[PDB]
Structures are given as structure tokens and as C-alpha cells.
Design a protein around this ligand. Structure first.
Ligand SMILES: *CC(=O)NCC1CCN(C(=O)C2(Nc3ccc(Cl)cc3)CCCC2)CC1
Ligand SMILES: *CC(=O)NCC1CCN(C(=O)C2(Nc3ccc(Cl)cc3)CCCC2)CC1
Ligand SMILES: [Cl-]
Ligand SMILES: [Cl-]
Ligand SMILES: [Mg+2]
Ligand SMILES: [Mg+2]
Ligand SMILES: [Mg+2]
Ligand SMILES: [Mg+2]
Ligand SMILES: [Mg+2]
Ligand SMILES: [Mg+2]
Lengths: 9, 236, 236, 9
């Protein structure tokens, strides 16, 4: 599973 | 520019419409047109630019990962090597992705960053610069992989330096920057301990400043803090 | 043609890859290239062509509906009329949608339909012809709205006539055709009673033939029958 | 709510 970056919403 | 004949305000309005319609390539084109008018962008407009290009590149990244996986599975001894098509098509998508990144980096270099004098604007654009070098890094294999990685690192670091001097630890731009830089460290730079340390320090320093915030600002900050926590859970 | 230099088999392979990657505009371009090689399409290849273009036009239809709704709300006395931008952008998307439909109709006319001699192929292509005239009808307002509607009706009717003569009532192509023609009657032709009658008769005649089917064919047929039932529930 | 036509999958 990939790390989470800043989303759009 | 195909958008040179359209009013700035009309481009912004159409970007908003495109967002509603989930037409992100159109949204990006409209926002590129707006940037190319030469005026600085407002906060809302910076967000429109980011949303548009993140969605476009996000589709490309997802497609590239699917194709890369198929290619890697194809390039083994088990099933069958089915000629050049998977490599060719992965390369096509890769090149398109690199082109989008080059476009965004171009807007930042000509001339968003140099005109951005406020902390919020400058940090926002430097974070974007880091992000799009990071997307280039995800697919880089050649002579310039190291240089691409360093370019991302340098942009993120400049952004961090400004953010720590000029913004509170709960500021959503500062938080999102730190989030993304931590992802850079973990996923790109092979520096998971740096990633973990940055995420933990960012989370803790934000926690300590939450008491200063309105209800709405609290929501904004804590939403990003949750993402830091999700990554820390994944990484440890 | 941008695809003229690529092997037919490579185009088909790349269409399959594009589907996996959810790159439907690429998928459509690859399949257009394959059609333009001039050879008849297999069942699997016909499905690839359909999936690709349905996804492309589906995105356009969704966007057009969003923009049309905003435009209609804008063109009233309550909020504010914000200049020509919504109309302009709706028109752009509309024109792009019409272009995709024209492309598909062109492939069918030159020369898929005329070379299609088996019931499965001919009915499939005539259904597609009906569908893409129906998508044109969804956005038509001018002098040709009636003619567009009649073109859809005529294609669907020819398909129905062949399907009733040559295919069992459970055949998935026959079922999907009847489903779509019933949608045409309800949504486009302002003929809800015709829609309901067609859906009911189609469902009932299929039900009576299910006993002839293998487990896998039963699954195929009943999945489409469910859609007939869902529409009947909505319509009555 | 709009009528359902034949899906892709
Ligand atoms: C004033 C200004 O430039 N604002 C940018 C704005 C900050 C608020 N915001 C967010 O909190 C989300 N997205 C981003 C995007 C980039 C950065 Cl650096 C930080 C936060 C919106 C959903 C996730 C957080 C939108 C952009
Ligand atoms: C042999 C041939 O031409 N087959 C086309 C094939 C039939 C099976 N099938 C389906 O059942 C679904 N889609 C369609 C699409 C068009 C028509 Cl006319 C009928 C059915 C797949 C999911 C919904 C039903 C795919 C196409
Ligand atoms: Cl290719
Ligand atoms: Cl427009
Ligand atoms: Mg002007
Ligand atoms: Mg073998
Ligand atoms: Mg390459
Ligand atoms: Mg050949
Ligand atoms: Mg008013
Ligand atoms: Mg028009």
C-alpha cells in the first residue's frame, strides 16, 4: 500500500 | 496559446464549471490559460490550478502503475513475452505524464514562483514544484534520476524553510507540504526514518497549536493531521 | 490515421491494455485504428469497440448534463445571469460529444454494417447505430431533431427485425437491443407505453426460454433481464 | 432518475 499525499478534497 | 483570446475571468469561471463536470483536462487547460495572462493567482485560483493538474496527473500515474505492473509481469519466466506493445504503451503514457509535469513546472518557473512574495503563495508553489519533480521521479530510471530527486528535495526544503519562519504549525499549506515531503522521503528518497521523523514532529507541533484555531480552521488542520497519522500507521 | 502504421493485432492488444488502465480515449483510438484496417471484427473485438466508445461518450453525456443543468438554472429569474460562459462551455462539450457520435456512426457506415452478414454482427452494429443517434438526440434542438430521432428508430427497428428472425429471445445481443430501444421510446420518443410494452414482452419471452440455457448463458441473459425489470419498476 | 441502458460490464 502506497503512502497518502495531500488530496484535492 | 489556445486560451489567449479568452478573458481571464472567463477562464476561471470555466475552470469552475469544468470541475463540476469532472472535466479535469479542460479544467487544467483553462487554468493554464489563466496563469498565462501573467497576473498573480489568488488563493482560490491557486487551488483550482492544483486540483486540475493533480487530477490529470493522478489519472496518468494510476495508468502508468497498471501498465508498469503488466510489463514487469510480462518480463519474467512464467507466462509469455508478448512482443513490444506493453513497453510501447507504458512509454507513451510515461511521456504524456512527463509532459504534464513539464507543463506545470514551466508555469511555476515562468513566472509564478518568482512573483510570489507572500508566504502562502510562495510555499504553495514551491510545494507544487516538489510534487511534480516527485511525479517525474516515480518514473525516472536514466542518467537524471538523481538530479530529479534532488530537484524535488530542494523545492520541498525551500518551502519548509519559509513555512517554519512564516506560518503557524497548523497552517494547512504548511501541513500539506510536510505531508508530501514525508511521502517523498519514504517513497522516493529511500529515507523512511526521515519520513517518520518529519511526520511525527509535524503532527505533534500542530497538535500543540490547535487551541488557537476557530472551529473551521480546526477542521482544516485536523483533516491533514489525520493523513500524517495514517502514514505513520502504515510506516511503523 | 495516426494508427495506420500499427499492426492490427498490436492495436487490439493495446486496446485491452488501455481498458485495464482505464484509458478509454486511448482504447477508442486503438479500436478505431483496428476498424480502419478494413477487416471484419470478431465478437471480442466488437465488444472492445463498444466498451471504449461507450465510456468516452458516457463521460461526455455526464458532463453535458451537469453543464446543461447549470445553464438552465442560470437562465431564470432568481440568482444571476453570469454572461456567455456556461452556454459557451456546454456548447464545446456538446460539439465534442457530437463529434464522437459522428466518428462511431462513420465507422459503422464505412464499412462495418455493410460487411456484417451474420445476425450477431449485424444486430450488434445496428444497435450501436441506434445508440449513437440516440446520444445525438439527447442534445438535439434544431431543424434535424426529428430526423435524428427517426434515424435512431430506423436502426433499432432493423436490428429488432433481424434479431426476432435469427436469435433466441434470451440472446444477450437481442436483449440489450430491446433494452436500449425501450429506453429510446421512454426517454427520446415520448412513447412510455411503447417502452413498457417492449420491455415487458422482451422480459416474458426471455423468461420462457431460460430453460434452454447453460449456467453461464443463464447468467448472461438474466443480468440483462434484471435491467428490463429495473426500468419497468421505474416506469410504472 | 434516468432509465438504464445496456452497460459495459
Ligand atoms: C490561500 C492558499 O493559497 N490556499 C491554498 C489552499 C489551502 C487549503 N486547502 C487544503 O487544505 C487542501 N489542499 C491543499 C493543497 C495544497 C496544499 Cl500546499 C495544502 C492543502 C484541500 C483538501 C486537502 C487539503 C486547499 C488549498
Ligand atoms: C458475439 C458478439 O458480438 N457479442 C457481443 C457481446 C455480447 C455479450 N455482452 C453482454 O452481454 C454485455 N454488453 C452488451 C453490449 C451490446 C449488446 Cl448489443 C448486448 C450486450 C456485457 C455487459 C452487459 C451485457 C458483451 C457484448
Ligand atoms: Cl502505443
Ligand atoms: Cl469554452
Ligand atoms: Mg482582459
Ligand atoms: Mg510458454
Ligand atoms: Mg521513457
Ligand atoms: Mg499487418
Ligand atoms: Mg440579483
Ligand atoms: Mg450546438
Amino acid at each position: 500500500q502506497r503512502s497518502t499525499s495531500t488530496p484535492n478534497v | 496559446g489556445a486560451m489567449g483570446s479568452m478573458e481571464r475571468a472567463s477562464l476561471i469561471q470555466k475552470a469552475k464549471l469544468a470541475e463540476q463536470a469532472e472535466r479535469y483536462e479542460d479544467m487544467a487547460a483553462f487554468m493554464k490559460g489563466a496563469v498565462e495572462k501573467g497576473e498573480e493567482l489568488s488563493c482560490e485560483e491557486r487551488n483550482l490550478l492544483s486540483v486540475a493538474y493533480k487530477n490529470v496527473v493522478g489519472g496518468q500515474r494510476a495508468a502508468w502503475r497498471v501498465l508498469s505492473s503488466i510489463e514487469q509481469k510480462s518480463n519474467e519466466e512464467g507466462s509469455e513475452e508478448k512482443g513490444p506493445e506493453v513497453r510501447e504503451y507504458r512509454e507513451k503514457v510515461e511521456t504524456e505524464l512527463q509532459g504534464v509535469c513539464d507543463t506545470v513546472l514551466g508555469l511555476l518557473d515562468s513566472h509564478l514562483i518568482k512573483e510570489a512574495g507572500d508566504a502562502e503563495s510562495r510555499v504553495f508553489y514551491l510545494k507544487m514544484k516538489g510534487d511534480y519533480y516527485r511525479y517525474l521521479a516515480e518514473v525516472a530510471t536514466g542518467d537524471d534520476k538523481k538530479r530529479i530527486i534532488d530537484s524535488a528535495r530542494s523545492a520541498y526544503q525551500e518551502a519548509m524553510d519559509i513555512s517554519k519562519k512564516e506560518m503557524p504549525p497548523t497552517n494547512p499549506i504548511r501541513l500539506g507540504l510536510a505531508l508530501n515531503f514525508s511521502v517523498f522521503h519514504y517513497e522516493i528518497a529511500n529515507s523512511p526514518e526521515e519520513a517518520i521523523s518529519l511526520a511525527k514532529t509535524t503532527f505533534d507541533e500542530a497538535m500543540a497549536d490547535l487551541h488557537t484555531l476557530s472551529e473551521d480552521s480546526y477542521k482544516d488542520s485536523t483533516l491533514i493531521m489525520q493523513l500524517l497519522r495514517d502514514n505513520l500507521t502504515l510506516w511503523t
